[PDB]
Structure formats: C-alpha cells, structure tokens
C-alpha cells in the first residue's frame, strides 16, 4: 500500500510569498494519478488539483501542480488570506488510495513573547482527590515554545500533555495549555513546582514557579 | 444549488453498528461516483471507500475492509456506508464525497457519464461517529486562580466529562475579550477534559468577580464557578 509523506511540515508564509508543497509516494506513481485538497478547520476539505496537474473547476491558476515517479509538488504562486489551511496530497495510482499526512501552511507575522502563567490544583480538586497542575502560555508567535516541567527540580516526563489554539483570526497568535497530571498522593510528597518556557521572544528561559502550600 | 447532506452520527459502543447515510442534489447524481473519507481527532485524513457510478465497482481502506460496505441508491439520490462491528479507532469526522464523472478504460478510451471514485471535487460537512464504552458524565469545573505581558490570567479546568461536547462562558457571557478556551483532550480513563482561561488587569482582581458558566447538556449539567485570588 502506497504511503504518501509530504514535507516540510509547515511553512511560515505571508501573503504574496510562494509556497511550494512536497510529497513523497514509497513507489512510483504515473504522473496522472494524483490529486491535492486544502482543508481549513471547521470547513469540508476542498479539490484543488487532480491529474497530476490539471486544476479543479473555480480554481485559479496561482495553484499549480505536478511531478512523477516518487515526488509530486504543489505550487501556490502568491498567498492569499484563505490559502492559509492545510494541505493534502492524494494517490489513486493504486487501491488502497491514499492521502499524505498535510503539510500546514501558516501566517508569518511579528515575534510576540507569550505571557506565562503558573496555576496548582485548586482545593475544590483536591477534596474531591485528584491533582492537575496548569500551565498557560498565552498569545505568543511562532509556534514553537519548550515547556518543560519540574518537580522538586526532577524533570518530569511522560506526565503532562499540550493542547494549543488555532492560530488566532485577529493578531495571529497561539495560546497554549500544558497540563500536569499527578496523584493527589505524589502532589503532597512535593513541594516545588515550575513550568520552564523557552521561546524566540524571550532573551532566556522563563519559569513560573509555586510552592506548595504557600 | 448542489450539495450533500450527511447524516446518522452518533455514539456507539465498540462492537456496535451504524449506518451513515448522504443525500445529493443538484447534479446528475447517477453519473457520479462516490466516496466517504474521515479525520480522526487530531489526525488527517483518511480515505475510507468510493464505488463509482452504477455501484459495481467498490473498494475499501485497509483498516476498514470487512467491516464497513458502500451502497448506493440512484433512484433517490443516497449513498450509504454501513459501518459495523465498530473499534475505538474508528471514532472520528466521516465525510461523505463526491468522485468523478468519468473513467477510463486500460486502454486510455475515456467514458463520459461513467463516474469513479479517484478523486473527490465536492464534500458534505461531514457527520460525528464516536466510538467508546465511557458513560456518560458530567464534568467537575475547577477554578483556576490568579503578571505577565502586562496582566493576570485565570480560568476553569473543567475535567472528566463524556461525552463532548461542553460550552464555556464567563460572568454570564458578557466576556469575550482575552478568553481562550482549549480543545479537549481524551485521558486515559476515556473522559475528557480542557481548560478555560482569560487575561485579566491585575489592579482589577480586587474589585470585580469572576465566574465561568460551563454547560454540559449531554449529562444536562450546569455550573458555575468563582475564582479568587
């Protein structure tokens, strides 16, 4: 079964740049059996181009695509607002047909540190026996930011998930949650507890911290 | 004027069945192929099944085969997808899709009105399939208690609840300002949970309240929380 892998991941674009998609099929499809989609959150996916090159009815020709072989790309040839989305390649070369894993195209703007906030579990939580330590790390751009947490100074691994925002309609930033699950048990054998922030608009690390009971 | 309308969602136990049915209009629906797709949480999409215009040729996504088969009624306009003997893996956005309106033989001779399922140019919605032997529950809310960039921040953690989705609102509604509220994360236990949270002036803490209206109407839950500094 054809896997398709597309690259980069994500590109930083503003409009009026090109973007140029990749994907990679682990066997040879013929120049004529490929199809590319845009997809926006909360929105049916959309055809952009099929037979390799040929684009779908209504869409206008700064969309170009093509390839063979093992690669195919998409072009947008200058970005515009709604071309921000994320974008799928798909094979019908050979059944099982398949899609690429997207590639999300974003909007580049200014470097905006997030704002970081440490909260620990609340007393209401605690009565009722569990324990959620949150960290926030608000309306900050680009993406990228390392949130590590530590516990009596261990860090801590494997006990903590992210969720994140959709890029923001207006100023086009991200929020993001890192939450720290343990037992009410272990919380009470600890004191210390700091969120570690590392992002490209801080000059160094920023850690927000509590202690226990204090 | 052409659309297609997906319906027959729902939750259902692992092991259960349900049928997933899409009406078109608009168009010549009888010379068309069609296909269903899905995106899992967090994942991308998924090509499921396709069977092109009079039904006879039909095919299935590896993790599917089996368990899941296409029909179609060109009388009235329905494709269906049955889907059966459901998995946790399965849960997911199911989109139902339109193929082409044409083939082409091994030969290179294209047929005009002989629609497959190769590509897919126009998508319902889609529909909620959610696979899980959770029970439904209503959530516990936790207040979230106030500087940085300026100001504090506060929030809810409303945690545990089953199925999705919850709303979230703060002093009554009137606040939407700096509000963030996150998508959900399934735990491990199966429930799920978020938080709610909003950047607030931190000369203000003091003079006003603060509370975040949180409904669940799948358990008819309602609650309303204060946070304080």
């Known amino acids: 079964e054809i896997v398709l892998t597309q690259s980069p991941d994500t590109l930083s674009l503003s409009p009026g740049e090109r973007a140029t998609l990749s994907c990679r099929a682990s066997q040879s499809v013929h120049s004529r059996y490929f199809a590319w989609y845009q997809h926006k959150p909360g929105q049916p996916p959309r055809l952009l181009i099929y037979?390799?090159?040929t684009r779908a009815t209504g869409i206008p020709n700064r969309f170009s695509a093509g390839g063979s072989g093992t690669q195919f790309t998409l072009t947008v040839n200058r970005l515009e607002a709604e071309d921000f989305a994320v974008y799928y390649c798909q094979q019908y070369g050979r059944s099982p047909y398949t899609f690429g894993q997207g590639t999300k195209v974003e909007i580049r703007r200014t470097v905006a540190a997030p704002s970081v906030f440490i909260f620990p579990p609340s007393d209401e939580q605690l009565k009722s026996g569990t324990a959620s330590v949150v960290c926030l790390l608000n309306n900050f751009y680009p993406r990228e930011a390392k949130v590590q947490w530590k516990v009596d100074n261990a860090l801590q691994s494997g006990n903590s998930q992210e969720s994140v925002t959709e890029q923001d309609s207006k100023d086009s930033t991200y929020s993001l949650s890192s939450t720290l699950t343990l037992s009410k048990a272990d919380y009470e054998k600890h004191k210390v507890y700091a969120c570690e922030v590392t992002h490209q608009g801080l000059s160094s690390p920023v850690t927000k911290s509590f202690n226990r009971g204090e | 004027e052409v659309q297609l309308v997906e319906s027959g969602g729902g939750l259902i136990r692992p092991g259960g069945s349900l049928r997933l049915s899409c009406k078109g209009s608009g168009f010549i629906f009888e010379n068309f192929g069609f296909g269903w797709v899905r995106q899992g949480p967090g994942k991308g999409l998924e090509w499921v099944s396709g069977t092109n215009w009079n039904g006879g040729d039909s095919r299935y996504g590896d993790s599917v085969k089996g368990r899941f088969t296409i029909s179609r009624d060109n009388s009235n306009n329905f494709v269906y997808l049955q889907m059966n003997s459901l998995r946790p893996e399965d849960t997911a956005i199911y989109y139902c899709a339109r193929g082409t309106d044409y083939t082409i033989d091994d030969q290179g001779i294209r047929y005009q009105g002989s629609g497959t399922f190769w590509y897919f140019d126009v998508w319902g919605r889609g529909t909620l399939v959610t696979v899980s032997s959770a029970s439904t529950k209503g959530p516990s809310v936790f207040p979230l208690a106030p500087t940085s960039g300026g100001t504090a921040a506060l929030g809810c953690l409303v945690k545990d609840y089953f199925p999705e989705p919850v709303t979230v609102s703060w002093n009554s509604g009137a606040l939407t300002s700096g509000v963030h509220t996150f998508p959900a994360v399934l735990q491990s236990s199966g429930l799920y949970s978020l938080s709610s949270v909003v950047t607030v002036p931190s000369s203000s803490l003091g003079t006003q309240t603060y509370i975040c209206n949180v409904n669940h109407k799948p358990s008819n839950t309602k609650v309303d929380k204060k946070v304080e500094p």
């Open positions: 037979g390799g090159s």
